[PDB]
Amino acid sequence: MQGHPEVIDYLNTLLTGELAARDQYFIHSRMYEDWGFSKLYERLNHEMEEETQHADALLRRILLLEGTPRMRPDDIHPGTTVPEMLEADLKLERHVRAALAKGIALCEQHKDFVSRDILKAQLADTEEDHAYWLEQQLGLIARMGLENYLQSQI
Amino acid sequence: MQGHPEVIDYLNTLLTGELAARDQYFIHSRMYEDWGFSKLYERLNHEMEEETQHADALLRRILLLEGTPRMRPDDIHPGTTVPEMLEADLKLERHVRAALAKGIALCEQHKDFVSRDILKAQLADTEEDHAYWLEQQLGLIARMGLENYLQSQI
Amino acid sequence: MQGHPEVIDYLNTLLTGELAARDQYFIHSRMYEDWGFSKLYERLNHEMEEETQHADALLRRILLLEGTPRMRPDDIHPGTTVPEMLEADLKLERHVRAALAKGIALCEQHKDFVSRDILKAQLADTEEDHAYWLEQQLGLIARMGLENYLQSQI
Amino acid sequence: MQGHPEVIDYLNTLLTGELAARDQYFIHSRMYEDWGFSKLYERLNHEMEEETQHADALLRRILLLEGTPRMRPDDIHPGTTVPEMLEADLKLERHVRAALAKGIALCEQHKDFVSRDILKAQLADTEEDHAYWLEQQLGLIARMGLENYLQSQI
Amino acid sequence: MQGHPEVIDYLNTLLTGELAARDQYFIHSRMYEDWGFSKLYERLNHEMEEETQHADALLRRILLLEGTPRMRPDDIHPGTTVPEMLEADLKLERHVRAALAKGIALCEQHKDFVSRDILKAQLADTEEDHAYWLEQQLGLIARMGLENYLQSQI
Amino acid sequence: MQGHPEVIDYLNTLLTGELAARDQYFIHSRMYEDWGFSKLYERLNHEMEEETQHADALLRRILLLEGTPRMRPDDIHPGTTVPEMLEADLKLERHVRAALAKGIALCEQHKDFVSRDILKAQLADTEEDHAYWLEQQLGLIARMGLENYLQSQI
Amino acid sequence: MQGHPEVIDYLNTLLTGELAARDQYFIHSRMYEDWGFSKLYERLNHEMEEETQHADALLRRILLLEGTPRMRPDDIHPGTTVPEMLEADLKLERHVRAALAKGIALCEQHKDFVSRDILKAQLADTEEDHAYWLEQQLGLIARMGLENYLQSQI
Amino acid sequence: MQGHPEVIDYLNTLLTGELAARDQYFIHSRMYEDWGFSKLYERLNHEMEEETQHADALLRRILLLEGTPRMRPDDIHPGTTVPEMLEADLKLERHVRAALAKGIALCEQHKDFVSRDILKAQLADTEEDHAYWLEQQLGLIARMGLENYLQSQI
Amino acid sequence: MQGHPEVIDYLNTLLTGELAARDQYFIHSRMYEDWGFSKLYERLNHEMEEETQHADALLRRILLLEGTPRMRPDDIHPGTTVPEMLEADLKLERHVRAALAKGIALCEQHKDFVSRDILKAQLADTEEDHAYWLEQQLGLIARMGLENYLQSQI
Amino acid sequence: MQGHPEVIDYLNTLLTGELAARDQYFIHSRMYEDWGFSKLYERLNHEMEEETQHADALLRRILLLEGTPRMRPDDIHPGTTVPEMLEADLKLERHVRAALAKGIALCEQHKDFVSRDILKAQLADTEEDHAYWLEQQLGLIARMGLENYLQSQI
Amino acid sequence: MQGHPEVIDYLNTLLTGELAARDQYFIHSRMYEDWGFSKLYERLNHEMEEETQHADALLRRILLLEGTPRMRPDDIHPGTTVPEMLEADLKLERHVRAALAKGIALCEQHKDFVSRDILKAQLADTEEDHAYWLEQQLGLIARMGLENYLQSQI
Amino acid sequence: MQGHPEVIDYLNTLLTGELAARDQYFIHSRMYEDWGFSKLYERLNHEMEEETQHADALLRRILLLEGTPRMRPDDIHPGTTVPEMLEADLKLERHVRAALAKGIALCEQHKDFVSRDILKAQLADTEEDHAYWLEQQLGLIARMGLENYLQSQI
Ligand SMILES: [Fe+3]
Ligand SMILES: [Fe+3]
Ligand SMILES: [Fe+3]
Ligand SMILES: [Fe+3]
Ligand SMILES: [Fe+3]
Ligand SMILES: [Fe+3]
Ligand SMILES: [Fe+3]
Ligand SMILES: [Fe+3]
Ligand SMILES: [Fe+3]
Ligand SMILES: [Fe+3]
Ligand SMILES: [Fe+3]
Ligand SMILES: [Fe+3]
Ligand SMILES: [Fe+3]
Ligand SMILES: [Fe+3]
Ligand SMILES: [Fe+3]
Ligand SMILES: [Fe+3]
Ligand SMILES: [Fe+3]
Ligand SMILES: [Fe+3]
Ligand SMILES: [Fe+3]
Ligand SMILES: [Fe+3]
Ligand SMILES: [Fe+3]
Ligand SMILES: [Fe+3]
Ligand SMILES: [Fe+3]
Ligand SMILES: [Fe+3]
Ligand SMILES: [Fe+3]
Ligand SMILES: [Fe+3]
Ligand SMILES: [Fe+3]
Ligand SMILES: [Fe+3]
Ligand SMILES: [Fe+3]
Ligand SMILES: [Fe+3]
Ligand SMILES: [Fe+3]
Ligand SMILES: [Fe+3]
Ligand SMILES: [Fe+3]
Ligand SMILES: [Fe+3]
Ligand SMILES: [Fe+3]
Ligand SMILES: [Fe+3]
Ligand code: NA
Ligand code: NA
Ligand code: NA
Ligand code: NA
């Protein structure tokens, strides 16, 4: 079934954003593991699997709409310390959030309600789970200090 | 069976106090969750269920005595930081404790011994579990400092 | 993540409406129990738990959006007979329904699609379960008469 | 295997009658549910599944006989109250009964004994279960009055 | 251990009251069974077992206090119709309630706190279960009429 | 609860479309079975059950909104060969898709968000499962030829 | 119990027809096995068991009616290729079908309704299972070609 | 549903025949038991249960057809020795067989095909099980002599 | 929470009494074991565990009230023969009983109802179990003589 | 532990090759699914998971050696038909094979035997499983033709 | 089978290194236990078992090659504080790593590929598990400070 | 994938060596069985299965490399007594060992690292299991004498 070219193009923009989120969590989770923070490894490894599923949903929708998926991830920007990595991932999730919300409005304007619903499901994941967890960690650092926080993530 | 109007009125005063305790623990438990302190969320969520049961016992007793329950909670006074919230809940429990003890004496004076027993059961919960746990947390903060304490409640 | 002040304020308006629905079902379910209608007690006790979950969803969303939840329930208006209580609860659910629908439109206008989805989930509960059950009971009373209906709810 | 054209045509007449019986029970069962009569919903939902199987048997037999099935249901005539719906379904079953009996005689005259047996199986269902249950409900209404009857079907 | 003679004598007064409550429920439960009201038989049979336990607690306490139990039940006053029997049992429970409350005050004045606690346990049973159930049945009769109520107790 | 007449009327238009989809899959699944293609029978039998559920959702929503459901299916247009039947079902699903999308926009304009959500759930089924499967079969025929495809569906 | 001589004689005619059907399926199933078509072996082996049961029913009925069974099978006419064998079995089943239908009419004319019912059970097997399966295979060959069909029966 | 008076009357004639068959097997089975032939007791006790089911089917059909069942059994004619009882039961079953066959023809002439099918089911039981077993026992007596036969039935 | 100094002091007086009861049962139970009376060892070992729990309840309550527990047991007065030990333990329990009852009155006068309830629970244990068992043993000795009694406690 | 810069750089070259292999299998597996070839979807989905593990091994080794992983995948070159995609994946695996073999020689020359072993494990996967499977599919197409091959992968 | 004398001698050099690693972990694990760090005891106890297996592999290989194992461990150099012990073990593992890598090159030059493989297996253990874990602990100390780190190892 | 001709040729040389080892163990194991040495039969039967797997690995690798396997086993040289057979098998394993080691060096020189790894796995089996077991048996004979050794292998 042929989708609207503007919707297909924008789904492709989101797809390359999700492939990048997957890859940023791939490097960050392994960096956390390398430093001995098993709880941060486990959380970010789990998020990497979740972004792979987000990407998969977009990729499959683009194919169903007879589009050609764009498979190059956006460039990523890993941190070099725990606070920088948490900040970098939060910036990433805020960008995804804004990009999804623009896509939701676009899908409504092109009367593609199934694509809109796919994006809204990911927006809820982005706001209520991914970004929220990151905000919580930065807030825990602010309240107990970085050293106590890092001890809790061994 | 028609209860004594003074006892019914005082049970209503206690009921609105218990509905408020339930609601203060509702907001505090969710604030703790929002900040990433799962152990404080779990404890205060559990206390919210316990105050709902305390309220239920009073509400049912008022109806059995052919009274009309007052269902508006007392106003609550949530804190804005972990130490303020613990303090606010302790002040709340101390007020409940005093209110229950006055009610126990009142029920005895009106020879309503079943109502008295209902209140004494809640007084033991208030003193030996609710208030006691809060005193313990504030004492833990005093002994290990706030930052170490907050780390323990993740 | 900072939500739009108008959306946060309106979520707070809905929250105090849900806290009230919880409390109206608390008093009504216990009144039904007091009169020996176990089936009405069980149904309204279950709805009280459902409104507590509705309130919880709004409260958590307000906190996630960096708002301060308003915890005072709206005033409630319990009935004094079975038909009055059913009517009062239906009036309550119709008001909730209208309030949610206005909030859904508001969330769309502020491009807060996750908040909109939270409200739409509650709107479906309100229309297809809560209000619907109440309409059914009043219709059963109309068809078999009040006395036969009350016998069926022992 | 090529069936007799008169038998195929008459099986088609019965098929559109069975598709209609299925659809009348579809609307009636959901109307009963909408009014809170779960026992009438369950019974008529079950009959809707039984008429779907009756239709299926006729449809498959028509295809086996190298006929082309007629898939438009006959028009249906739903009631607007419980007594009218029971009456309308009984009128429907009486019509089906007569139509099946004519078909049984026709199949014998064309020496199509397998088609005859298919119809006789449905005739027994129609007389001994479908129509019989409806006669029983109308008789229960006559003996205990409509209001007591409707109470029994909640 | 020698109890206070006034307390022992009053426990004996209560014991003969409990033996009577047991016997009134014995005759009423069997009358209900004789008329075909299995639910009233089961409830009053259960209450007869509960009053036997109440009597047993008093009898054992009197012996422990080196008193001689009085074993003649008070005279009972069975009804002749369902409404009269419910009324007669409610009058019985109201009398027990008042007698227990006087005994509680007496035990306190003689500093016999264990006897007081035994009586308070029975007072809660009397008010919150025995008398309450009877009030509920009479209220159900008032709301749905006697005939519908009796049908519900088959 | 009284729905908007334009929304009720349009839900009725969709209902007769879903009843037709159910019936087209009823005849097609049995035709496939008659020819020995058990895999096509099983798939289309399953879709017939899915369209019955789609119809049921619309029918129930119309009743809840105090409308009168229209129960006559739209006319159907069965094929006479496997490729024609697949094509006819795809044309059917494309029509359903367009009709649902118009209804979604209509429900939004009348601020009936629960009806809108019911339609969006069916739109996702229509696009991502029903129509998609049919497109896949026609594409398999194009890639391996009809004869090899039909062999795979025995 | 002495049956009618014309009915006994005709049952014997059918018995020798069923013994032949058993034997034609015996040779065909083993020929299919010899060529490597396990699915055709399994199907025709199963039909051979079914014809043995058909023969058994006739043989037992003839004995019950005090007749002497004729045990020589009719001559059979096996094919030499898969299409010829399917055709030969279909011709066989069409002959059985016609012979059974004549016997059904004969049994009715001699008021032997139990014999008639035995024949009608076999007629349904013959039309709806045995002949139908063979028609389906020939139709599959027509639709996908012989080579693809034979591959599917390995 | 009102049956044809001639069919109802004839079903009543059959019903009194089946009630008699039940009663003849009641006395015969107990006579066999009294003499120590447990195998004949068990067989005839089982047949008595089967005739009770035959009677039940006729009785229920007569009521469904709005007839009044005739409940007096036909007179029975028990034997006084094992060979006489077997003979008497065979004569009974032959009479039932003939009566059922006449009823089958009558039901067809009045186009009551469900009643006809009820009778045909009983006719098969009568011919293939009840009468057949009795013929077998008499034949066993003829082949091994009465004394050896009776030994086998201990 | 700061308790009343007079209540704390009196709880301390009771605590040292309970620590002594524990220790008197420790020596007596082991003396009984040393002489071969396993049943007296088991009973007094069990009472020693019960007094340890009584002491624990008082100790914990004193700490909760911000008092400093007094941990020196009162002096104990073990017997030298079975009758002397039973007598010594009964004297001990009578003293505990009186001390608890005075404490109950004191707690009421200082409106410390939770402390009062703790004491009343122990008073019931003291009267109805500990002292009662001892009275029973001395009474058994009086009724069967010491030698028969001691034989029963091996 | 600081690795040799030339080895770290070459591991990074391999890592971006493995991230690309993962992504080419991501798009190809979903394209196969979109066309209805479930067996090709399952195989390539499984290979995508295997390349993710290959990438993970390299990424972790680079971090252990105190290098900074390069996370941008190499560009990929998806096909547009089944034969092109198989060819494109085989070209990809041949390139990986050659790149790994060069890396193995490099690791030996820098006496990094653990890195060498990591690469040799992946080389065996590449040659004996990934590339081999692709060669097999192309060979199956050559032997049975593309259409028969594609039928086998439904 | 006679091994090369230079390879046997070098395996002996490695064996005495592994016996020493076992013994250094023996003393360190017990020192950690003595200080109350159960997690460091468990880890180093596990490494002591792993070095015993490394030694065993070398010892067995030397015997298989008809060499005489050297069983004196190299001298060890335990630390006196947690940071010194971690450092001392890391220095030990770095020395083992270098010694193994030299042995791998030596085995290749003498074409003893099985001995080489034994050493490479231990080299991977040394680099990727033993040394890596130690680097991680020192890095955790650097990031959260020694005191927080030691608390985490209780 | 086309392997290097020199590597393929040498793998073929090894393959015919492994086929011979399989066959020498086939004859030796059966000779041991024939003489009553079940333990030698079981061991050499197991080695025959192991050499079949070694051959299989080489054969499959040669095919993967697009070579043509040479399937003639090398000539074998069975012994005629237990000591001769053990010696002959040890000579065989020493030859295999040397042949594998030459092949390992050859594979490295042609940069075929997967083939090298296949050979190294077999070299470890040859040295550490096959040859080692044989050396052990000859050494056991030297230490306890042949007669005692043979007794141990019954
Ligand atoms: Fe998750
Ligand atoms: Fe995402
Ligand atoms: Fe995300
Ligand atoms: Fe608790
Ligand atoms: Fe409370
Ligand atoms: Fe509280
Ligand atoms: Fe619910
Ligand atoms: Fe709500
Ligand atoms: Fe609600
Ligand atoms: Fe049924
Ligand atoms: Fe039907
Ligand atoms: Fe019907
Ligand atoms: Fe009870
Ligand atoms: Fe009582
Ligand atoms: Fe009572
Ligand atoms: Fe599905
Ligand atoms: Fe649909
Ligand atoms: Fe559809
Ligand atoms: Fe079959
Ligand atoms: Fe047959
Ligand atoms: Fe047949
Ligand atoms: Fe039977
Ligand atoms: Fe019968
Ligand atoms: Fe019979
Ligand atoms: Fe005890
Ligand atoms: Fe005590
Ligand atoms: Fe005590
Ligand atoms: Fe794999
Ligand atoms: Fe790879
Ligand atoms: Fe690969
Ligand atoms: Fe390990
Ligand atoms: Fe080591
Ligand atoms: Fe090590
Ligand atoms: Fe082995
Ligand atoms: Fe080998
Ligand atoms: Fe070998
Ligand atoms: Na700390
Ligand atoms: Na009634
Ligand atoms: Na083909
Ligand atoms: Na004999």
Side-chain angles (χ1 to χ4, degrees), chain D residues 17-69:
Chain D
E18 299 300 313
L19 295 170
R22 164 196 67 168
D23 286 347
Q24 186 155 309
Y25 290 142
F26 199 179
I27 182 59
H28 280 171
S29 60
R30 275 59 173 169
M31 285 171 67
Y32 286 138
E33 188 64 345
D34 173 74
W35 293 335
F37 298 116
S38 72
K39 299 196 186 322
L40 290 168
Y41 165 73
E42 292 285 348
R43 170 73 182 175
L44 278 306
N45 177 64
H46 175 65
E47 314 287 63
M48 174 184 78
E49 297 175 341
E50 290 184 328
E51 301 295 7
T52 300
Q53 295 171 2
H54 282 179
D56 193 13
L58 294 170
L59 190 178
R60 293 186 195 232
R61 180 63 177 170
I62 292 159
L63 290 169
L64 181 157
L65 294 177
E66 305 185 32
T68 301

Side-chain angles (χ1 to χ4, degrees), chain H residues 26-101 103-110 112-134:
Chain H
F26 199 179
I27 182 59
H28 280 171
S29 60
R30 275 59 173 169
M31 285 171 67
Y32 286 138
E33 188 64 345
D34 173 74
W35 293 335
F37 298 116
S38 72
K39 299 196 186 322
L40 290 168
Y41 165 73
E42 292 285 348
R43 170 73 182 175
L44 278 306
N45 177 64
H46 175 65
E47 314 287 63
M48 174 184 78
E49 297 175 341
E50 290 184 328
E51 301 295 7
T52 300
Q53 295 171 2
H54 282 179
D56 193 13
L58 294 170
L59 190 178
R60 293 186 195 232
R61 180 63 177 170
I62 292 159
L63 290 169
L64 181 157
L65 294 177
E66 305 185 32
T68 301
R70 290 205 300 262
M71 294 299 301
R72 207 180 61 188
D74 294 346
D75 270 336
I76 61 167
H77 298 291
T80 71
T81 66
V82 177
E84 292 176 5
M85 301 152 67
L86 291 169
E87 295 283 9
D89 286 345
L90 182 56
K91 182 169 180 177
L92 181 44
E93 294 286 339
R94 290 185 164 164
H95 179 272
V96 171
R97 200 223 76 78
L100 287 169
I104 287 165
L106 178 68
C107 288
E108 183 83 6
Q109 107 179 229
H110 288 280
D112 186 348
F113 306 110
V114 174
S115 289
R116 172 160 162 124
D117 282 352
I118 294 172
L119 304 186
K120 289 195 307 168
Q122 297 197 18
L123 181 71
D125 292 343
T126 299
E127 290 187 8
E128 310 219 310
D129 193 285
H130 295 178
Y132 200 22
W133 180 86
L134 292 163

Side-chain angles (χ1 to χ4, degrees), chain G residues 1-101 103-110 112-154:
Chain G
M1 165 185 63
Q2 167 73 42
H4 293 291
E6 287 171 50
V7 172
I8 296 168
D9 182 65
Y10 198 76
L11 295 178
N12 264 328
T13 294
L14 293 169
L15 171 56
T16 64
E18 299 300 313
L19 295 170
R22 164 196 67 168
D23 286 347
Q24 186 155 309
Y25 290 142
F26 199 179
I27 182 59
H28 280 171
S29 60
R30 275 59 173 169
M31 285 171 67
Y32 286 138
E33 188 64 345
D34 173 74
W35 293 335
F37 298 116
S38 72
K39 299 196 186 322
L40 290 168
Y41 165 73
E42 292 285 348
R43 170 73 182 175
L44 278 306
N45 177 64
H46 175 65
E47 314 287 63
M48 174 184 78
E49 297 175 341
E50 290 184 328
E51 301 295 7
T52 300
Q53 295 171 2
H54 282 179
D56 193 13
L58 294 170
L59 190 178
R60 293 186 195 232
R61 180 63 177 170
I62 292 159
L63 290 169
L64 181 157
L65 294 177
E66 305 185 32
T68 301
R70 290 205 300 262
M71 294 299 301
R72 207 180 61 188
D74 294 346
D75 270 336
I76 61 167
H77 298 291
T80 71
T81 66
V82 177
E84 292 176 5
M85 301 152 67
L86 291 169
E87 295 283 9
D89 286 345
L90 182 56
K91 182 169 180 177
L92 181 44
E93 294 286 339
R94 290 185 164 164
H95 179 272
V96 171
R97 200 223 76 78
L100 287 169
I104 287 165
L106 178 68
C107 288
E108 183 83 6
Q109 107 179 229
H110 288 280
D112 186 348
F113 306 110
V114 174
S115 289
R116 172 160 162 124
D117 282 352
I118 294 172
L119 304 186
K120 289 195 307 168
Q122 297 197 18
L123 181 71
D125 292 343
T126 299
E127 290 187 8
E128 310 219 310
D129 193 285
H130 295 178
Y132 200 22
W133 180 86
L134 292 163
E135 290 174 329
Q136 292 186 10
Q137 309 318 295
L138 289 162
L140 287 169
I141 289 160
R143 291 172 163 83
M144 69 190 59
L146 180 56
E147 293 80 9
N148 276 349
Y149 173 76
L150 289 179
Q151 185 199 328
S152 80
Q153 300 300 306
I154 291 168

Side-chain angles (χ1 to χ4, degrees), chain B residues 7 10-11 14 96-101 103-110 112-124 126-127, chain E residues 116 120, chain I residues 107-108 112-114 116-117 120:
Chain B
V7 172
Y10 198 76
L11 295 178
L14 293 169
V96 171
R97 200 223 76 78
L100 287 169
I104 287 165
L106 178 68
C107 288
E108 183 83 6
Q109 107 179 229
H110 288 280
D112 186 348
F113 306 110
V114 174
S115 289
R116 172 160 162 124
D117 282 352
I118 294 172
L119 304 186
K120 289 195 307 168
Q122 297 197 18
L123 181 71
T126 299
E127 290 187 8
Chain E
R116 172 160 162 124
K120 289 195 307 168
Chain I
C107 288
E108 183 83 6
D112 186 348
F113 306 110
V114 174
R116 172 160 162 124
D117 282 352
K120 289 195 307 168

Side-chain angles (χ1 to χ4, degrees), chain B residues 18 21 50-51 54 93 96 100 122 126 130:
Chain B
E18 299 300 313
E50 290 184 328
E51 301 295 7
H54 282 179
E93 294 286 339
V96 171
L100 287 169
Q122 297 197 18
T126 299
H130 295 178

Side-chain angles (χ1 to χ4, degrees), chain J residues 1-101 103-110 112-154:
Chain J
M1 165 185 63
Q2 167 73 42
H4 293 291
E6 287 171 50
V7 172
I8 296 168
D9 182 65
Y10 198 76
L11 295 178
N12 264 328
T13 294
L14 293 169
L15 171 56
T16 64
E18 299 300 313
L19 295 170
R22 164 196 67 168
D23 286 347
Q24 186 155 309
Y25 290 142
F26 199 179
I27 182 59
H28 280 171
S29 60
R30 275 59 173 169
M31 285 171 67
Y32 286 138
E33 188 64 345
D34 173 74
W35 293 335
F37 298 116
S38 72
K39 299 196 186 322
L40 290 168
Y41 165 73
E42 292 285 348
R43 170 73 182 175
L44 278 306
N45 177 64
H46 175 65
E47 314 287 63
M48 174 184 78
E49 297 175 341
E50 290 184 328
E51 301 295 7
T52 300
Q53 295 171 2
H54 282 179
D56 193 13
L58 294 170
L59 190 178
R60 293 186 195 232
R61 180 63 177 170
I62 292 159
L63 290 169
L64 181 157
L65 294 177
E66 305 185 32
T68 301
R70 290 205 300 262
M71 294 299 301
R72 207 180 61 188
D74 294 346
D75 270 336
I76 61 167
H77 298 291
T80 71
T81 66
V82 177
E84 292 176 5
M85 301 152 67
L86 291 169
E87 295 283 9
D89 286 345
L90 182 56
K91 182 169 180 177
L92 181 44
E93 294 286 339
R94 290 185 164 164
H95 179 272
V96 171
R97 200 223 76 78
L100 287 169
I104 287 165
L106 178 68
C107 288
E108 183 83 6
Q109 107 179 229
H110 288 280
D112 186 348
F113 306 110
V114 174
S115 289
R116 172 160 162 124
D117 282 352
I118 294 172
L119 304 186
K120 289 195 307 168
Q122 297 197 18
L123 181 71
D125 292 343
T126 299
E127 290 187 8
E128 310 219 310
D129 193 285
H130 295 178
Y132 200 22
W133 180 86
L134 292 163
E135 290 174 329
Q136 292 186 10
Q137 309 318 295
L138 289 162
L140 287 169
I141 289 160
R143 291 172 163 83
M144 69 190 59
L146 180 56
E147 293 80 9
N148 276 349
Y149 173 76
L150 289 179
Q151 185 199 328
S152 80
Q153 300 300 306
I154 291 168

